[PDB]
Amino acid sequence: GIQKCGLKVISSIVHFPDALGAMDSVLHTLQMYPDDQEIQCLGLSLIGYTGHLLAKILVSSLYRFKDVAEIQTKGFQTILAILKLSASFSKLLVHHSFDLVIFHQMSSNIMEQKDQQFLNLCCKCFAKVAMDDYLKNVMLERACDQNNSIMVECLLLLGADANQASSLICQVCEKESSPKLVELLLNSGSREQDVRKALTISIGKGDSQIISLLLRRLALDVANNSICLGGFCIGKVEPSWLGPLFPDKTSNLRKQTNIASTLARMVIRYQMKSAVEREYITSLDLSANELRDIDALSQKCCISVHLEHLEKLELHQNALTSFPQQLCETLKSLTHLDLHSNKFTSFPSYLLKMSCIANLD
Amino acid sequence: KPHNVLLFTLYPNAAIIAKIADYGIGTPGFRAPEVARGNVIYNQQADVYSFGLLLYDILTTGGRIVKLPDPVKEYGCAPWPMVEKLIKQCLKENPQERPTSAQVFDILNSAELVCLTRRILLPKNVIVECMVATHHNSRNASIWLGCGHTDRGQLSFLDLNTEGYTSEEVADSRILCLALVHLPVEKESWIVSGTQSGTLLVINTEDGKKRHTLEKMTDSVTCLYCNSNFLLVGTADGKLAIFEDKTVKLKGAAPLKILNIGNVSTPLMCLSESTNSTERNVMWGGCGTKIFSFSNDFTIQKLIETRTSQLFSYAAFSDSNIITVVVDTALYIAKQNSPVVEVWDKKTEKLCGLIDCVHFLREVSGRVKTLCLQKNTALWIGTGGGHILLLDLSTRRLIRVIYNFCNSVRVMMTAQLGSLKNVMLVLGYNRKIQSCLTVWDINLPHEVQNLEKHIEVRKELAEKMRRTSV
Ligand SMILES: Cc1ccc(C(=O)Nc2ccc(CN3CCN(C)CC3)c(C(F)(F)F)c2)cc1C#Cc1cnc2[nH]ncc2c1
């Protein structure tokens, strides 16, 4: 119990010249008594300058409390000092728990509070650990493991290899993830084969949202006003999947947030300072998809009013057996209809009921 | 031959699209002239000529298959001129003149090859100062270039669809800037013309007999703007004349208000509208060294002073008038005879950042000339050195620099053609004086990024495949 005012007297003595080990003793105390000594652990100065357990105790005590305003600021100050004393400290930090506390502290509504100096020192520590781009890839992978989509964009803006490794994208779609994360990943670089495997995985665990988000890059050409789902072996079709692929002019663009961009910009600044110091979709290709039946499409679904403007519907090399009549009467602008290499057994007479059929195959 | 190219997909942004195959089954239609004469074996130089024939067929959509003629004349097709130059280069009779295959791939790797759509050379080479487009989406898709060549003006009219143009003097003195108004309810399309003697005139394009003039300003006409209505006039004496869109058809209408925002020592040069729809009620402009914003009710909203900019940057460059303005979430200002562009915030009315084009240009006079910005977060900086700078609004970093096509960018605007497509016109100087107009696709930056990613993916694929081979 008396160790509290003892450490207070030590803090009183830290200002006298030539204070020199004393680090080990107070380290053992802070390891023993968690709460009150940590509030006074700011007395920790540059001592020892390489025990990984020291930084481990530091960051574990930080995240263990993580809810008293000024003690986290003091800890960040001490951390900045130590990393200024040694750059190898960075690797150890990212190794032990650094991300686990940084993300939790800056995602917990860090903005909307008059903590300008807090965010400044925090982004300084960010830019400081931003070196050693391998550690940046590690930070990206760990931020993607967590469902923390707020700083994946920040990590990408600073420059991060989304193809670092089983790539990142397949890992993201393997777990129940958020659309913003997969969208930010797909916008940045991504190997087409990796995106393909990701689509296979997401097909295995049906999720219309991420499926549409993937198809919005894999098989959509806004220029040609066409969909090019040719040979993706997608065992079926769902109108919800192609839902967000059609224009839907009622949708618009709105900047939901910019905090990630501001963050990235300010960490880039701190790093620089430290270095110095109509138009419908008129084509829909579904060839070689190994389909079995195309009745999910139409049925008065969302896609049903975005098919009346279709002017070409290729369906070759699949495995169909029949063509639903409601699909025909809905498709009121088809001109080219390709059904070759399917498995049909008798000609449906009503295929000629369409308004503008001109090339039946 | 085009029969020897196998396509694997029709998706533009695909990793692999075309492949080469030799089925083992030269042909008269697709043989090199050196091979046609029977001089020697094909060697490797001829293959470039065959590839040029393939380019000529792809450009013309195979029209030749169903002493080579002009691709645009013989068959209807868009210009696409960089590849026209490439075809003319690699179809030369002299086998030494044929560029090597690596050179062909290198000059094909440029995003300028895809984004540059047209190019026009004015033969009379009259020194042009201003140019405005016509929003009429009909077949009357042209530009209304104006220039000061004699004691009167030189009123040009370049027809994009026909590439022919007519010039003559109709405004009694040197002309500076132009603007167009289209009244769809009145079916009226009127262009307002100003001279340096201090008069405003209108000239209806639908009939050259319909000419009009407005109230004289004592200084020289300096600027114009169409607010979709209120026609704005920014003169050298700081006046802000508001002309009713309707009445000014007849000769001699009158301004509804006169807001003496500035004076002769700081003339008003440029105005613009908020790109964000939430501020479509406030209009902005840089009156000399004064960034003024005002309402749609002809009432001032703010008056900012630029003179504080000397304490941070160089006072010499900061002691200049404002040439171009752009209104976004952040305000971007370019000053006369200065290589820096000033970034301001519309809320705090305080300086936020500076961008030095000198660093990027020397990385390759550097004076900024004109600005155009799009909601796609891509910024275009036209430099007096004939360079175009591409900057992104998200990170304020470099994208690409465009040069070696004109000697000095004069005016750069945004417009739309009759095919509803969005393009950008870049008027650049060519002193050996020659005036060249170039039409650039509005998807230039996204195209650069896509092409970079695509070529990187292909290089990685080839490297991995060759490594697995060894
Ligand atoms: C089934 C098949 C066998 C062989 C080849 C072939 O080309 N081989 C081949 C031969 C020679 C050369 C290069 N020699 C080097 C010596 N020189 C003196 C001359 C050039 C090349 C290369 F140039 F590649 F190196 C490729 C293509 C196909 C095929 C196919 C196919 C695929 N897909 C299709 N879809 N529809 C139809 C269709 C057809």
Side-chain angles (χ1 to χ4, degrees), chain A residues 1-2 5-6 12 17 19-22 25-26 29 34 41 43-46 48-51 55 59-61 68-69 71 75-76 79 81-83 86-87 89-90 92-93 95 98 101-108 116 118 120-122 125 127 129-130 134-136 138-140 142-144 146-160 162 165-166 168-173 177-179 181-190 195-196 198-204 206 208-215 217-220 222-247 251 257-264 275 280-289 291 294 296 304 306-310 312-313 315-316 318-325 327-331 333-342 344 346-361, chain B residues 1-21 23-26 28-30 32-36 38 42 44 46-49 51-66 68-69 71-72 75-81 83-87 89-92 95 98-114 116-123 126-133 138 141-149 153 155-158 160 162 164-165 167 170-171 175-181 184 189 191-194 196-200 202-205 208 211 213-214 216-229 231-245 247-248 252-256 258-262 264-275 277 282-290 292-296 299-300 303-305 307-328 330-346 348-358 360-361 364-374 377-395 398-419 421-448 450-451 454-455 457-459 461-462 465 468-469:
Chain A
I2 66 170
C5 198
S12 190
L20 192 46
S25 298
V26 302
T29 68
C41 86
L44 261 69
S45 297
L46 291 86
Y49 263 85
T50 313
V59 304
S60 49
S61 65
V68 176
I71 73 161
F76 280 132
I79 282 304
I82 300 157
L83 58 84
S86 176
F89 201 64
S90 70
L92 205 157
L93 283 179
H95 181 287
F98 192 53
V101 73
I102 296 298
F103 290 97
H104 185 292
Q105 288 313 112
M106 288 314 110
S107 308
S108 308
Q116 294 79 8
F118 189 28
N120 285 134
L121 53 90
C122 175
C125 195
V129 303
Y134 153 66
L135 306 179
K136 298 183 64 178
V138 187
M139 284 272 293
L140 181 66
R142 302 173 73 181
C144 282
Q146 296 178 356
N147 193 89
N148 196 46
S149 65
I150 180 59
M151 304 199 215
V152 54
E153 184 174 356
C154 199
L155 265 295
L156 290 184
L157 285 192
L158 271 297
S166 45
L168 266 73
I169 173 62
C170 63
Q171 305 161 25
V172 186
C173 53
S177 314
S178 197
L181 173 51
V182 64
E183 204 278 337
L184 289 165
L185 261 178
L186 269 295
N187 279 342
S188 159
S190 296
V195 184
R196 184 79 46 82
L199 172 59
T200 71
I201 296 175
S202 160
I203 284 293
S208 180
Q209 201 47 263
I210 310 305
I211 284 176
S212 158
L213 268 293
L214 282 171
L215 261 46
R217 175 176 187 288
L218 269 176
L220 186 132
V222 62
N224 286 74
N225 293 319
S226 76
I227 315 301
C228 278
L229 300 156
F232 294 149
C233 287
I234 303 169
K236 50 155 77 173
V237 293
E238 285 295 335
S240 86
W241 301 357
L242 309 164
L245 285 191
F246 293 125
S251 65
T257 186
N258 317 120
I259 177 171
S261 44
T262 63
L263 282 182
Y280 302 107
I281 293 301
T282 63
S283 158
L284 170 54
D285 197 315
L286 296 168
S287 88
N289 263 335
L291 304 188
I294 295 169
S304 168
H306 306 137
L307 295 174
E308 301 195 9
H309 303 103
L310 203 47
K312 158 184 305 178
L313 178 53
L315 277 171
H316 52 280
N318 295 9
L320 271 79
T321 312
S322 199
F323 210 77
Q325 168 171 18
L327 190 49
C328 310
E329 50 181 343
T330 290
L331 277 159
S333 297
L334 263 176
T335 73
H336 300 51
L337 173 54
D338 205 320
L339 311 177
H340 77 247
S341 299
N342 276 2
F344 271 85
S346 308
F347 191 83
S349 179
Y350 56 86
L351 277 167
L352 313 182
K353 288 275 207 48
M354 300 160 158
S355 68
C356 318
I357 182 63
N359 169 249
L360 186 42
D361 190 319
Chain B
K1 317 157 301 176
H3 176 233
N4 279 27
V5 161
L6 295 176
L7 297 199
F8 280 59
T9 182
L10 295 195
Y11 197 71
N13 294 307
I16 300 178
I17 301 184
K19 293 196 181 181
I20 286 189
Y23 320 127
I25 293 179
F30 323 102
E34 37 190 6
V35 176
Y42 305 75
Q44 61 164 353
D47 278 3
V48 173
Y49 180 95
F51 182 76
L53 274 183
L54 177 51
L55 265 291
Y56 184 81
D57 297 330
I58 290 177
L59 195 155
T60 57
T61 70
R64 185 180 59 83
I65 293 91
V66 307
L68 209 54
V72 185
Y75 320 92
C77 48
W80 190 46
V83 159
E84 290 181 349
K85 169 181 287 189
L86 159 59
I87 284 175
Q89 280 191 29
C90 75
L91 287 199
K92 286 184 176 177
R98 306 196 211 283
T100 194
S101 161
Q103 277 157 350
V104 180
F105 170 79
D106 186 12
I107 64 173
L108 265 181
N109 198 18
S110 88
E112 301 86 346
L113 185 136
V114 190
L116 179 52
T117 307
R118 300 195 64 164
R119 185 163 195 177
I120 295 182
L121 276 300
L122 304 183
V126 189
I127 50 172
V128 291
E129 294 185 359
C130 67
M131 44 158 284
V132 302
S138 88
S142 161
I143 316 295
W144 279 104
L145 277 81
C147 42
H149 191 228
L155 277 302
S156 316
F157 173 72
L158 160 68
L160 303 172
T162 79
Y165 83 108
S167 298
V170 75
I175 61 174
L176 277 80
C177 310
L178 299 173
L180 182 142
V181 55
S189 77
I191 306 100
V192 296
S193 198
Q196 85 164 334
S197 194
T199 53
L200 271 185
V202 191
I203 299 149
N204 171 34
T205 173
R211 298 208 149 108
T213 307
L214 271 294
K216 159 201 286 294
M217 58 202 68
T218 49
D219 272 330
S220 313
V221 192
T222 307
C223 174
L224 286 159
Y225 193 91
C226 181
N227 174 272
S228 76
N229 312 296
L231 285 198
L232 295 172
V233 185
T235 78
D237 40 322
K239 268 74 158 180
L240 192 147
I242 305 96
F243 281 152
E244 300 162 338
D245 58 351
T247 305
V248 295
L256 57 95
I258 290 166
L259 282 193
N260 299 322
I261 307 304
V264 299
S265 46
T266 43
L268 172 47
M269 273 76 69
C270 50
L271 281 81
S272 61
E273 179 175 340
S274 176
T275 56
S277 43
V282 62
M283 303 284 106
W284 302 69
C287 171
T289 49
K290 302 198 310 302
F292 67 97
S293 64
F294 58 100
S295 56
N296 284 326
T299 68
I300 311 167
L303 302 161
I304 320 179
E305 185 55 79
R307 293 322 304 127
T308 187
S309 299
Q310 61 91 6
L311 66 95
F312 194 88
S313 196
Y314 306 156
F317 289 137
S318 286
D319 212 37
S320 157
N321 270 347
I322 293 173
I323 287 302
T324 61
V325 288
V326 175
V327 193
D328 307 306
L331 301 177
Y332 309 83
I333 304 301
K335 305 169 91 166
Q336 218 162 12
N337 215 323
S338 177
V340 65
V341 53
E342 190 155 354
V343 181
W344 281 358
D345 180 73
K346 46 194 179 194
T348 77
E349 305 191 15
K350 185 55 65 178
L351 189 144
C352 319
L354 281 302
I355 300 302
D356 52 324
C357 308
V358 293
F360 313 138
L361 269 295
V364 188
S365 284
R367 310 189 169 100
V368 59
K369 268 304 205 160
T370 178
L371 266 73
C372 288
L373 192 140
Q374 53 175 14
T377 77
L379 176 53
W380 309 59
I381 308 296
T383 77
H387 322 268
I388 299 187
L389 179 54
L390 273 301
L391 298 186
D392 59 336
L393 296 192
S394 57
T395 80
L398 189 148
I399 292 183
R400 198 164 183 76
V401 290
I402 312 304
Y403 58 96
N404 71 85
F405 73 113
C406 303
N407 283 129
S408 313
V409 168
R410 176 55 160 186
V411 190
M412 160 184 300
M413 298 292 186
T414 318
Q416 180 189 61
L417 295 204
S419 297
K421 52 185 184 306
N422 267 337
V423 300
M424 174 168 310
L425 291 84
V426 174
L427 199 156
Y429 283 165
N430 200 331
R431 186 51 171 103
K432 35 178 179 45
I433 297 178
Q434 181 65 46
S435 61
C436 196
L437 273 297
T438 56
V439 175
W440 296 83
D441 197 357
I442 207 65
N443 298 280
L444 197 158
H446 324 313
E447 177 58 39
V448 182
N450 290 328
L451 189 50
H454 167 99
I455 192 51
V457 163
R458 296 193 85 256
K459 283 189 297 294
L461 261 184
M465 182 173 317
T468 58
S469 71

